[PDB]
Amino acid sequence: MSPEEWTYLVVLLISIPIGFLFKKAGPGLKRWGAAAVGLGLTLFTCGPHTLHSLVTILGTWALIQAQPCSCHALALAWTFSYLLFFRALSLLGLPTPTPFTNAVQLLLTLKLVSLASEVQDLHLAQRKEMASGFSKGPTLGLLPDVPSLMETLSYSYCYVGIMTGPFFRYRTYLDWLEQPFPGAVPSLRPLLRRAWPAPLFGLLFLLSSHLFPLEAVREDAFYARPLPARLFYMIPVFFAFRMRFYVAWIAAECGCIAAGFGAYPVAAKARAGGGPTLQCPPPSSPEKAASLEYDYETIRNIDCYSTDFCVRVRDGMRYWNMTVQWWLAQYIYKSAPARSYVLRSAWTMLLSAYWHGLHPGYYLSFLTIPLCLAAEGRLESALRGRLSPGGQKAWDWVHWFLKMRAYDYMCMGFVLLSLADTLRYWASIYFCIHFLALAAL
């Protein structure tokens, strides 16, 4: 229980009542108050290192006006290079940043890249508009006009999704500020419907944290235990990892609901992170708005049930970090210069690892993932069509066990974060999953 993550948790907790208070606020007042609160918390928890974020936003805006025709790739390359610059402060002797600053930088990178893509699409839209001579109607998902510098500053430093997230597109911010009759959309009932497992999840996390500490594998004497002891110990590590991320993300989603952010009509058939996909009429009367049913799935970042009890590794990863996953899938997977599915997936994995960090553990884990992914694709597409329904049930059960074991196996490599200890523990288990993965493939 580090002091920094303690401050992280208390910030996540206090994000809720401020959400309640700013729900009732009018559009301009809510906008300015959210920006001020985000900036204040950023200064409180980041110190003098907010200059990196400020420079990043200023550069994004300057590139938007400088090259509106090609702001997408320019902004993406600039932001990735500036991430490289920011993570090499020790290499250049500049003061080291707190992990708070690193997380804030990841979130800002995602947000600004999405904003640049929206500006690119909108500019191409106007260009085609006066090229064709037929002004089309307002299309859902497109920005009304180019944002101003102060508007971008207010959007970026929103207290929602500034420390943990989850990522939201700018269009979502505009729909949140322009949402009519804020008192009509329900907040307390969905907040209770999502916050019921948070205390239990937290207690479960602390249980596995105290019983089986992660630092044991750093100690050499742990390896003297028999291989079965390691096989039983390798489960609670990812149990605690998943449980802690579940607690944090459930708390973040509840805090985001508290402000009514991401609320859309159910008839819009909105997607996780993607916002609405079908246009719906804005409410005309507060009673009509209260009559409609509302969902907060756009901000939904994790599905506990699906990820915990999935069958295939592909779907398990799909339901993991749905927001950022959609962000990657659109801005990188679609724009990947490669054509092969394997190579495009490798590009996405490499960029995700680069986003997470420069430490070799991320690289090793996200490079080992494709092996089991391809092995699974081949084995499933080759054998699932041959088994009986009882054989199908047995395959599904054994597969759930194997998939959770693979998640554990790669979780150790992800969380040790050090090449030497990771390799030592990986050889300590005799590369069990890797050999089976090659056997499966």
Residue numbers in the entry: 1 to 441
Provide text from the study.
Membrane-bound O-acyltransferase (MBOAT) 7 acylates lyso-phosphatidylinositol (lyso-PI) with arachidonyl-CoA. To adjust membrane properties according to need and to store specific fatty acids as precursors for bioactive lipids, cells remodel the phospholipid acyl chains in enzymatic reactions known as the Lands cycle. MBOAT7 mutations cause brain developmental disorders, and reduced expression is linked to fatty liver disease. Here, we report the structure and a model for the catalytic mechanism of human MBOAT7.
MBOAT7 comprises 11 transmembrane (TM) helical segments, connected by short intervening helices (IH) and loops. TM8, containing the putative catalytic His356 residue, resides in the cavity between the two TM bundles. TM8 exhibits weaker density than the other TMs, indicating flexibility or multiple conformations in the apo state of the enzyme (TM8 density shown in two σ values). A tunnel twists through MBOAT7, connecting the cytoplasmic and the ER lumenal sides of the enzyme, with the active site located in the middle of this tunnel. In MBOAT7, the lateral opening of the tunnel has an extended channel that branches off to the lumenal leaflet of the ER membrane.
